[PDB]
């Protein structure tokens, strides 16, 4: 009886390994057939259209006190910008960066100035004696609220000043009409500093004198706003990855239009007739205006793949090939 069951188990190994041979040959033959169909630009246009129509059928980095205080600070900046002009805004931004360098270097001062305290008038007094002669009054009027509010760590004051200086600089792009251009140049710098591991790691120089990184950007890397945003960011970089920080600049820059960014992957050259539909269905899916960062690549040939926030919708010949080969018996 054990021999009889052992022969049936031997047959079971034969018919199973036969099916692995047939399955591997069938998926590899299918991969050749679909790659050859996929080669046509009409077939890719039908694949992205089929994907799009299928999809049509279908401060949070901060603790509570800091989140509330930053929301109030940005709400005051919206009032200060309501009377501002570009030749004032570029000065407000360079001056807010300059005090962010002071607070970052004089860590004793920052550890007192950030002190969470409801009776905040002494802290305003310290800022008043230290800054009132050094810098323009509109910066003091914004720093008064930055100090008088409550922060969850000593870092979160430097994070709020840096973010306010960045907002002040973005406002020049908004008033001048360059908002789309600076977005495109920030995604350009975001992708190139991701593809260039030598220069971006060297721009992460928070262990080195920052003026060397500022001079590097001036020589290597254009709209003067995008240059200024990069130079401000490397100055205040504090051990973040440079490419990842430039991506956080671009995410903030779209967030000032109320929208969010979806990165997109396609075979090549997704046409405007695709882009208007893709943005419209993404807008339905996520309930917001959107922008697409087109990261075209041949290794993900056929279909379309997209990522936004934490989710991905990922329909491509290469992803669906992995789904087909892994499902084999």
């Amino acid at each position: 009886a054990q021999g009889a069951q052992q022969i049936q188990l031997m047959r079971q190994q034969l018919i199973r390994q036969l099916r692995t041979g047939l399955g591997a040959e069938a998926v590899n033959k299918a991969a050749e057939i679909v790659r050859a169909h996929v080669a046509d630009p009409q077939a890719q246009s039908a694949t992205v259209d089929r994907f799009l129509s299928e999809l049509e059928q279908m401060t949070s980095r901060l603790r509570a006190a800091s989140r509330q205080s930053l929301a109030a600070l940005v709400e005051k900046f919206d009032s200060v910008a309501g009377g501002l002009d570009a030749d004032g805004l570029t000065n407000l931004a360079d001056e807010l960066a300059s005090v962010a360098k002071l607070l970052l270097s004089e860590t004793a001062l920052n550890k007192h100035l950030a002190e969470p305290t409801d009776d905040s008038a002494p802290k305003v007094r310290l800022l008043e004696r230290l800054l009132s002669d050094k810098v323009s009054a509109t910066t003091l009027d914004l720093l008064r609220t930055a100090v008088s509010n409550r922060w969850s760590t000593e870092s979160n004051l430097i994070d709020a000043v840096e973010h306010t200086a960045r907002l002040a600089l973005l406002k020049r792009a908004e008033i001048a009409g360059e908002v789309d251009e600076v977005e495109e140049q920030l995604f350009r710098f975001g992708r190139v500093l991701d593809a260039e591991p030598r220069l971006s790691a060297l721009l992460s120089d928070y262990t080195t004198p920052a003026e060397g990184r500022v001079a590097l950007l001036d020589k290597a890397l254009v709209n003067q706003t995008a240059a200024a945003l990069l130079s401000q960011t490397v100055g205040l970089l504090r051990g973040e990855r440079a490419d990842e920080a430039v991506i956080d600049l671009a995410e903030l820059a779209v967030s000032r239009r109320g929208e969010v960014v979806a990165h997109v992957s396609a075979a090549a050259e997704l046409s405007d007739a695709q882009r208007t539909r893709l943005t419209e269905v993404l807008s339905r899916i996520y309930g917001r205006p959107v922008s697409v960062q087109l990261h075209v690549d041949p290794e993900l040939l056929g279909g379309l793949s997209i990522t936004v926030g934490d989710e991905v919708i990922d329909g491509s010949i290469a992803s669906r090939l992995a789904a087909a080969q892994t499902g084999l018996p």
């Binding site: 603790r63 509570a64 006190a65 509330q68 969850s152």
Partner: protein, 464 residues
């Protein structure tokens, strides 16, 4: 508006709130788990405030399938349990939901399980002796009616056989009402007790609360407080005399040690929580007999690794009027109930309270067993005969006394098949008076094992 989950660490859940909506300590917070076969409403108790409207909670159901960012609603009151005369007969989890039929008790008066213990003006010492009818307990460790009593022991020495014996000695004839707390003990024993109390017809006057082994440390500690909050209702509002059997009150401090390491408080000695004595105090003081109204607590206390120095046993040793220290050594001899006579103690063993003839005998017996234990280091090497004759006389009666502190219990019938015996206090004192005066030194040691009283000793001696 309401709170949101922020962080999860097994049974500990950290949640934030709007700036003004922060809950108090010990509030019950509901949260939703919304996956598959484990979708459940989750009861959280608030243990700490961390700053910036964060509060750290303990979870009364397993947190598996909980998600960060789910809404958390503050009920604005502590965990509350049903109390009332209609609580007796039923079986509850820590949260006060009836296991037998979940719709029961939701219309009753509900009391918050967190309460201040009775103020010092209302406490008074209890000194009335409780007749149990076990020889070693009534003689050497006399239990206190309205006191706190404990059964310390290792693993598998018979702590729970003594609790289900004491249910048959006391709760069957006791004119009051019994509460049973299952704190971290076997679910199998909860079922074998529930079907026994039904067959004995005692169930009509007892409420059972169970927070057995299979439950997360939040409810495995909060079950003791829930069961006690039923007992405090029977004591205070119904004016009854109460029994409160807790088994096993070491699992209360153990579940406290688990949550403390997850709350991230620094570990104490041998990895217990700090506040081991304050958490144990907050339980053990509430279970007291105020002036007009008695509560006869009885508590099994596990002793881990048989280490009678361990901080949890050493902390609970202060709270007790009688302590019955069970021992692996006495268990290995088969001398059930396995009470170690020299370690066990009672506060009412004083001649002013038990009378001279009891106290004289209970010091002669302890002197003898003490002298035998202080000869044990020689006995182990040489055996008996190398002792002096005044010591050999003593050890021959000490070994008889030691075996005569054994008894055939009512609870032992499920293992030995023999019936159970009850020995009155007077026949207990007389027998040990005669033994210590030497009347029985001609009878063999095997004549004294597992036997109820003098008449049954005589019969067993004549069987040999």
């Amino acid at each position: 508006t309401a709170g949101r989950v922020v962080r999860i660490t097994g049974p500990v859940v950290d949640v934030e709130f709007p700036r003004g909506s922060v809950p108090e300590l010990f509030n019950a917070l509901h949260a939703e788990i919304t996956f598959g076969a484990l979708a459940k409403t989750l009861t959280l108790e608030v243990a700490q405030h961390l700053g910036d409207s964060l509060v750290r909670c303990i979870s009364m159901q397993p947190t598996d399938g909980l998600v960060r960012g789910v809404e958390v609603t503050d009920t604005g009151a502590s965990i509350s349990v049903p109390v009332g005369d209609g609580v007796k007969g039923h079986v509850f989890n820590a949260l006060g939901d009836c296991l037998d039929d979940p719709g029961y008790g939701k219309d009753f008066e509900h009391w918050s399980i967190h309460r201040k213990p009775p103020a010092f003006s209302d406490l008074e010492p209890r000194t009335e002796m409780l007749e149990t009818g076990l020889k070693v307990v009534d003689l050497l460790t006399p239990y206190v009616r309205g006191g706190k009593i404990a059964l310390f022991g290792g693993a598998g020495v018979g702590k729970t056989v003594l609790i289900q014996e004491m249910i048959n000695r006391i709760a069957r004839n006791f004119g009051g009402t019994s509460v049973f707390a299952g704190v971290g003990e076997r679910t199998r024993e909860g079922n074998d007790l529930w079907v026994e109390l039904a067959d004995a017809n005692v169930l009509k006057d007892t409420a059972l609360v169970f927070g057995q082994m299979d439950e997360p440390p939040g409810t495995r500690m909060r079950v003791a407080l829930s069961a006690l909050t039923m007992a405090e209702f029977f004591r205070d509002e119904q004016g009854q005399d109460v029994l409160l059997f807790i088994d096993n009150i070491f699992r209360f401090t153990q579940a406290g040690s688990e949550v403390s390491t997850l709350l991230g408080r620094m570990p104490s000695a041998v990895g217990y929580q700090p506040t081991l004595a304050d958490e144990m105090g907050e339980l053990q003081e509430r279970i007291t007999s105020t002036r007009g109204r008695s509560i006869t607590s009885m508590q099994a206390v596990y002793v881990p690794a048989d280490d009678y120095t361990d901080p949890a046993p050493a902390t609970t040793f202060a709270h007790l009027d009688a302590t019955t220290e069970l021992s692996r050594a006495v268990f290995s001899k088969g001398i059930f109930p396995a009470v170690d006579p020299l370690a066990s103690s009672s506060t009412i063993l004083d001649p002013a309270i038990v009378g001279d003839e009891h106290y004289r005998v209970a010091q002669e017996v302890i002197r003898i067993l003490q002298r035998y234990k202080d000869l044990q280091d020689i006995i182990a090497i040489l055996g008996i005969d190398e002792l002096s004759e005044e010591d050999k006389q003593l050890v021959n009666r000490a070994r008889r006394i030691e075996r005569f502190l054994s008894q055939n219990m009512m609870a032992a019938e499920q293992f030995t098949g023999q019936p159970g015996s009850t020995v009155p206090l007077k026949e207990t004192i007389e027998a040990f008076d005669k033994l210590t005066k030497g009347e029985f030194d001609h009878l063999p040691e095997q004549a004294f094992f597992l036997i109820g009283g003098l008449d049954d000793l005589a019969k067993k001696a004549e069987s040999l």
